[PDB]
Enzyme design. Structure first.
Site, PDB file in Angstrom:
ATOM      1  N   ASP A  65       0.762  -1.213   0.010  1.00 32.76           N
ATOM      2  CA  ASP A  65      -0.008  -0.091  -0.031  1.00 32.76           C
ATOM      3  C   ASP A  65       0.887   1.486  -0.099  1.00 32.76           C
ATOM      4  OD1 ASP A  65      -0.947  -0.740   3.453  1.00 32.76           O
ATOM      5  OD2 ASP A  65       0.929   0.334   2.627  1.00 32.76           O
ATOM      6  N   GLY A  71      10.793   0.163   9.682  1.00 32.95           N
ATOM      7  CA  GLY A  71      11.614  -0.645  10.627  1.00 32.95           C
ATOM      8  C   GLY A  71      11.180  -0.384  11.993  1.00 32.95           C
ATOM      9  N   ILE A  75       7.038   4.914  13.049  1.00 33.33           N
ATOM     10  CA  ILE A  75       5.450   4.365  12.876  1.00 33.33           C
ATOM     11  C   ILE A  75       5.361   2.903  13.431  1.00 33.33           C
ATOM     12  CG2 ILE A  75       3.690   3.860  11.276  1.00 33.33           C
ATOM     13  CD1 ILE A  75       4.649   6.644  11.065  1.00 33.33           C
ATOM     14  N   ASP A  89      -9.236  -1.505   7.113  1.00 31.63           N
ATOM     15  CA  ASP A  89      -7.950  -2.626   7.341  1.00 31.63           C
ATOM     16  C   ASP A  89      -7.141  -1.826   8.275  1.00 31.63           C
ATOM     17  OD1 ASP A  89      -7.821  -4.409   4.480  1.00 31.63           O
ATOM     18  OD2 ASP A  89      -9.479  -4.141   5.778  1.00 31.63           O
ATOM     19  N   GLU A  96       8.333  -4.003  14.780  1.00 35.92           N
ATOM     20  CA  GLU A  96       8.264  -3.438  16.301  1.00 35.92           C
ATOM     21  C   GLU A  96       8.052  -4.793  16.896  1.00 35.92           C
ATOM     22  OE1 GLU A  96       8.593  -0.590  16.732  1.00 35.92           O
ATOM     23  OE2 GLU A  96       8.183  -0.012  14.898  1.00 35.92           O
ATOM     24  N   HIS A 113      -5.920   2.275  19.121  1.00 43.18           N
ATOM     25  CA  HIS A 113      -5.792   3.455  18.437  1.00 43.18           C
ATOM     26  C   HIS A 113      -6.072   3.034  17.079  1.00 43.18           C
ATOM     27  CE1 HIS A 113      -3.766   7.285  17.610  1.00 43.18           C
ATOM     28  NE2 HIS A 113      -3.859   6.827  16.335  1.00 43.18           N
ATOM     29  N   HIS A 117      -9.165   4.675  14.023  1.00 44.82           N
ATOM     30  CA  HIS A 117      -9.086   4.875  12.573  1.00 44.82           C
ATOM     31  C   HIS A 117      -9.947   4.111  11.903  1.00 44.82           C
ATOM     32  CE1 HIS A 117      -6.170   7.744  13.387  1.00 44.82           C
ATOM     33  NE2 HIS A 117      -5.151   7.217  13.764  1.00 44.82           N
TER      34      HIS A 117
END
Ligand SMILES: COc1ccc(S(=O)(=O)N[C@H](C)C(=O)O)cc1
Ligand SMILES: [Ca+2]
Ligand SMILES: [Ca+2]
Ligand SMILES: [Ca+2]
Ligand SMILES: [Zn+2]
Ligand SMILES: [Zn+2]
Length: 158
Positions: A65, A71, A75, A89, A96, A113, A117
């Site tokens: 996407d 890494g 994010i 999705d 992580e 969280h 979204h």
């Protein structure tokens, strides 16, 4: 912006992080959906096959996407707003280290969280809210949505 226009919502775990016990991934995702169905008319159900509304994916780097991961750190995850196909999705960065606790990055807190979204919620400027733009671990056995998270979700549903 988009919201789900139906009360029964399905999800599916596309694959499982090796960071955790499988049953622990299942329970963390389930608890995370529950946080939201606690304050709305939504019902969430895990399906094991076929097309779910919300596909839960662990992936790293470029993963098909426009929201390439980066890494370890930076994010942690991202999710799409309500809609068909990839809409809804939620993707989690495999770089992580996912845990049930305060070590690594907590999947449950992250998933709360990200599901916000997935349901169409944006970010809050209030550091107490789970939808604050940046991750901050809080004790998950006593976790509660902030009043700010509650007003945000209830402005979309119910
Ligand atoms: C626990 O909440 C958080 C989980 C992940 C992140 S994040 O990974 O820093 N940012 C992504 C894009 C997002 O806002 O969804 C920020 C907060
Ligand atoms: Ca990362
Ligand atoms: Ca979808
Ligand atoms: Ca990992
Ligand atoms: Zn992605
Ligand atoms: Zn976010």
């Amino acid at each position: 912006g988009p919201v789900w226009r139906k009360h029964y919502i399905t999800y599916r775990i596309n694959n499982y992080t090796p960071d955790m016990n499988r049953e622990d991934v299942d329970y963390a995702i389930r608890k995370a959906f529950q946080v939201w169905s606690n304050v709305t008319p939504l019902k969430f159900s895990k399906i094991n096959t076929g097309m779910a509304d919300i596909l839960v994916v662990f992936a790293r780097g470029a993963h098909g996407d426009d929201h390439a991961f980066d890494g370890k750190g930076g994010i942690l995850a991202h999710a799409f707003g309500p809609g068909s196909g990839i809409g809804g999705d939620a993707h989690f960065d495999e770089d992580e280290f996912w845990t049930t606790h305060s070590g690594g990055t907590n999947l449950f807190l992250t998933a709360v969280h990200e599901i916000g979204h997935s349901l169409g919620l944006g970010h809050s400027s209030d550091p107490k809210a789970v939808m604050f733009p940046t991750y901050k671990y809080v004790d998950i056995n006593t976790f509660r949505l902030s009043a700010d998270d509650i007003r945000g979700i209830q402005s979309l549903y119910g």
